[PDB]
């Protein structure tokens, strides 16, 4: 892990630096987008000058035949139309290869991530991951994907996606590998105009363990801040569509009696479910007092508002004026919060919303019953090991340019 790290690209003072201790020099050439909510992740374009070049330390420039090593990062690959990207053409995004094409290379194809390793002689080996088109909800398209590559010179080279091993090939037939002095983050030879997101690039001087890859997958993003649908930080005062992870083919619509329905099947474009369907919500801080940033953290006290128009917002509340155990979620047209709050929490990328009374009493987690979105306390004792456990897990879909559906 941190002991074996020889290159850690992190953000500091309007630039990117190496925090491994070997003092590698990172430079930005052109227009490199920096995410304002998380400046460690950056975007590179191909319609203009946009690249990030890492001049490695002379110590860490790989020039061995037996030393194991690993490479880790996260990549975000948008599929704007799911038609403009339908071109069989391999294009390189990360290039640590010399003039004689010795070294390593991370390239992309249509819904495909390719790893290539070549020695000084020219013997090469390739690993690949094809996640394919979306069949319902895709966990990879326009989302942050954790890529890890381990290399045992006396054994196999393995590729891991989100901590799961997916492709291993022997590299025993490769000799001396002298990688490039530079690590170039740039989109080259791409058939179309696009951008690519990269974050948390790390180089280790050993073959990473599976548990080490899992710890990296779980702790590199901030575990205290909630995540949205794409894997970015969940934001306050930001419009989001809702997605229930147990019924991913359904969306939430508004009823005339202020209740919320779930019997609405998502329309499909080819085999991909439409993401921008249903009601829109906004998260608002209860106790503002200018508490730093707009990031939604665990155990936060928030209000969930429904967006009727661009200017009109109406709080969502749990109707406790019923004999049922589960409380249906209603829209307060008057603006009355009904003396309730919502507590945010998360398991991994999935978010939970606990409706609570102001006196501290629990009303329940946000889930659904039959046709209607409700708040229920049952989810408290059945967070796992039940077919209905995932009914309280929600994803917030932000309408972005990287995912277009018309």
């Amino acid at each position, epitope marked *: 892990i941190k002991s074996s790290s020889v290159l850690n690209m992190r953000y500091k003072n309007d630039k990117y630096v190496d925090t491994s201790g070997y003092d590698s020099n990172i430079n930005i050439n052109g227009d490199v987008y920096k995410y304002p909510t998380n400046k460690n992740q950056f975007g590179i374009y191909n319609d203009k000058l946009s690249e990030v070049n890492i001049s490695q330390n002379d110590y860490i420039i790989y020039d061995n035949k037996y030393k194991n090593f690993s490479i880790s990062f996260w990549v975000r690959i948008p599929n704007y139309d799911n038609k403009i990207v339908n071109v069989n053409n391999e294009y390189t995004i990360i290039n640590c290869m010399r003039d004689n094409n010795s070294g390593w290379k991370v390239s992309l194809n249509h819904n495909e991530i390719i790893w290539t390793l070549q020695d000084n002689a020219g013997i090469n080996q390739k690993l690949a991951f094809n996640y394919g088109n979306a069949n319902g909800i895709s966990d990879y398209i326009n989302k942050w994907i954790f890529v890890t590559i381990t290399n045992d010179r006396l054994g196999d080279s393995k590729l891991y996606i989100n901590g799961n091993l997916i492709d291993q090939k022997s590299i025993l037939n490769l000799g001396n590998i002298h990688v490039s002095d530079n690590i170039l983050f740039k989109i080259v030879n791409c058939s179309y105009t696009r951008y690519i997101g990269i974050r948390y690039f790390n180089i280790f001087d050993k073959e990473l363990d599976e548990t080490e890859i899992q710890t990296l997958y779980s702790n590199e993003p901030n575990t205290n801040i909630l995540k949205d649908f794409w894997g970015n930080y969940l934001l306050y005062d930001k419009e989001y569509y809702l997605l229930n992870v*147990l019924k991913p083919n359904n969306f939430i619509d508004r009823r005339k009696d202020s209740t919320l329905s779930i019997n609405n099947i998502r329309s499909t474009i080819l085999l991909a479910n439409r993401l921008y369907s249903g009601i829109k919500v906004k998260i608002q801080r209860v106790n503002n007092s200018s508490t730093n940033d707009n990031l939604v953290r665990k155990n936060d006290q928030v209000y969930i508002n429904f967006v009727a128009s661009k200017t009109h917002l109406f709080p969502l509340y749990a109707d406790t004026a019923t*004999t049922n155990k589960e409380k249906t979620i209603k829209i307060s047209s008057s603006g009355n919060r009904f003396n309730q709050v919502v507590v945010m929490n998360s398991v991994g990328n999935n978010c939970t919303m606990n409706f609570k009374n102001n006196n501290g009493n629990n009303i329940g987690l946000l*889930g659904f*019953k*039959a046709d209607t979105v409700v708040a229920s306390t049952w*989810y408290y004792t059945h967070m796992r090991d039940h077919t209905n456990s995932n009914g309280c897990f929600w994803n917030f879909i932000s309408e972005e340019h990287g995912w277009q559906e018309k």
Partner: nanobody, 127 residues
Framework: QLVETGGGLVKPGGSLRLSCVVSGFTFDDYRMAWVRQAPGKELEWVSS????????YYEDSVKGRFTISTDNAKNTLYLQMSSLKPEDTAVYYCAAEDRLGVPTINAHPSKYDYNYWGQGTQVTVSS
């Protein structure tokens, strides 16, 4: 298309077999239920069955006399009522709940406690 049949007039102590034909979904994705409605009372849940796990649920004032059942094809729901009392004179409705929802059972359910309601069959216990 939820349709119920088998209700009618019986004397105290008689027997009936209510059946409920279902079109559009199987009992593997839905939990089935029988709910009663007295003329001057609100809706009262009678019974419920899961087809994936044969665990059944009954109400206290009705257990022992009623038996809920499901056919091997999972398209027809049955309720065998025996030793009928005059308190059972009500309209009986077939109901279907999404199994993936919150599995709580309300004794006085509203219309949103189940996905689909039937047309209702009348059961009368009179001399």
């Amino acid at each position: 298309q939820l349709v119920e049949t088998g209700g009618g007039l019986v004397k105290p102590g008689g027997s009936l077999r209510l059946s409920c034909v279902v079109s559009g979904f199987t009992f593997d994705d839905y939990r089935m239920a029988w709910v009663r409605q007295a003329p001057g009372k609100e809706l009262e849940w009678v019974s419920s069955i899961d087809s994936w796990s044969i665990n059944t649920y009954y109400e206290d004032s009705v257990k022992g006399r009623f038996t809920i059942s499901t056919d091997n094809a999972k398209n027809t729901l049955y309720l065998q009522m025996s030793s009928l009392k005059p308190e059972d004179t009500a309209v009986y409705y077939c109901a279907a709940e999404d199994r993936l929802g919150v599995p709580t059972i309300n004794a006085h359910p509203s219309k949103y406690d189940y996905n689909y309601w039937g047309q209702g069959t009348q059961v009368t216990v009179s001399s």
